């Protein structure tokens, strides 16, 4: 009763950080490749089609943050349980999250569906021009449970060191979505709604794999059954203690990017075009970090389960090192090949280079405050990972951008310095928790 992933988790923290992060970074990246595909197919459809997607953006990101957040709590809870050699607890978190996926998932469907037609009118939609917005959001919400179930299944797997089969789910989902996108949109001639049916149908297949894995094959470490089910008030508090603040965190990172564009619109439209494009390019370097963060949580949780800080500190500190040296390469590439990177994303070329030479430099500082939030979720304290994210993106990143604006260079100058301070605050606070554990 011990799989390969468990032996990684219950082993050398340095070995665990790497061999879990790589397939995660892969999985995180292959799905980003989809967003670029679906990004270029939808573009050619016309002005009217992009207006339905952009309106269906908050509801999508809203139910992605929820699904992913619940998965983070699941991943962290199972990881901590397995670290403490508690199978009976680990098996019981897997079942608890599966029921929560049903509750959270379907509720998202039945709550949003009757409210989706007023959402558009509230924003000021015409009724015929944005009549696709309701049709696009209808298809996605019809699988809002599948999205959550997929995330939970992914959270269950990476929570027991099974990042390889977790990667498979991310690839199979993005791959099918990639091949069905041109067929549904263009070949079958469904238009923008075809992209929704492609995403829907692809997630169904992923769940079929996920279900086959932990319901049919059952070749996973944990045992999933209801035969002697014990509804726990503690496991429920556990998953939500990380999950709920995780959902708000993923929202806050993008709910602050709006204010950054507001400081770009105030300093106007030609400036917002420069900011948005430069931001999209620079933010691509976050994808490798996200994998490291997903791997950090899994290993600092197992170390917290094994109750030894030297392992928890090693994995969390090793995580920063690799993420530092990964961004070191990324930043250099973007700064050196700036005109080359601009050409592909601009089909304002001069103002973009002025950004892509200064702005991306904050990517190097990021891993400090990010691995800390990751291990904060690893030990189970998500409320601290949330308040550190609020401090970073909304308080410092935005606050400095407004302090410099009251030209356009002050926007990147605010984002960098604001994220520089937040990294310093984040790393120190992460260190303090370690010493507090060493004294516990």
């Amino acid at each position: 009763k011990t799989t390969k992933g468990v032996q990684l988790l219950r082993g050398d923290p340095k070995k665990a950080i790497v061999r879990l992060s790589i397939p995660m970074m892969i999985g995180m990246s292959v799905q980003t490749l989809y967003n670029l595909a679906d990004g270029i197919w939808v573009s050619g459809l016309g002005p009217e089609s992009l207006a339905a997607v952009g309106l269906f953006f908050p509801v999508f990101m809203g139910i992605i943050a929820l699904a992913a957040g619940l998965g983070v709590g699941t991943s962290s809870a199972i990881a901590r349980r397995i670290g403490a050699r508690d199978k009976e607890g680990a098996d019981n978190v897997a079942v608890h999250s599966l029921i929560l996926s049903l509750i959270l998932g379907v509720t998202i469907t039945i709550t949003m569906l009757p409210a989706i037609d007023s959402l558009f009118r509230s924003m000021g939609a015409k009724g015929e021009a944005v009549e696709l917005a309701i049709e696009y959001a209808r298809v996605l919400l019809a699988g809002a449970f599948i999205i959550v179930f997929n995330n939970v299944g992914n959270g269950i797997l990476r929570g027991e060191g099974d990042a390889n089969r977790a990667m498979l789910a991310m690839v199979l989902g993005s791959g099918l979505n990639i091949v069905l996108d041109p067929i549904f949109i263009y070949t079958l001639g469904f238009g923008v709604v075809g992209a929704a049916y492609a995403t829907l149908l692809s997630m169904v297949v992923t769940s079929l794999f996920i279900a086959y894995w932990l319901f049919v094959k059952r070749d996973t470490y944990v045992d999933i059954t209801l035969r002697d089910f014990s509804p726990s008030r503690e496991i429920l508090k556990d998953i939500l203690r990380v999950g709920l603040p995780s959902s708000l965190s993923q929202l806050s990172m993008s709910i602050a990017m709006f204010f950054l564009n507001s400081v770009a619109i105030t300093a106007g439209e030609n400036g917002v075009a420069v900011f948005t494009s430069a931001w999209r390019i620079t933010m691509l370097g976050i994808v490798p970090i996200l994998g490291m963060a997903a791997a950090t949580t899994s290993v600092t949780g197992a170390a917290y389960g094994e109750r030894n800080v030297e392992k928890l500190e090693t994995a969390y500190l090793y995580a920063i090192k690799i993420a530092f040296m990964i961004e070191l390469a990324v930043v250099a590439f973007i700064m050196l090949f700036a005109p080359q990177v601009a050409y592909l994303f601009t089909y304002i070329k001069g103002d973009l280079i002025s950004a892509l030479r200064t702005l991306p430099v904050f990517l190097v500082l990021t891993p400090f405050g990010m691995m800390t939030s990751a291990m904060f979720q690893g030990i189970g304290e998500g409320e601290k990972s949330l308040i550190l994210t609020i401090f970073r993106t909304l308080v410092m990143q935005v606050g400095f951008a407004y302090i410099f604006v009251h030209g356009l260079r002050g926007v990147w100058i605010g984002i960098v310095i604001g994220n520089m301070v937040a990294a310093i605050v984040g790393f120190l606070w992460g260190r303090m928790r370690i010493s507090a554990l060493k004294k516990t």
């Binding site: 997929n150 999209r280 996200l290």
Partner: peptide, 11 residues
């Protein structure tokens, strides 16, 4: 993408 985080991070 979907699993996990947000991301996108693209339009």
């Amino acid at each position: 993408x979907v699993y996990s985080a947000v991301c996108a991070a693209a339009a």
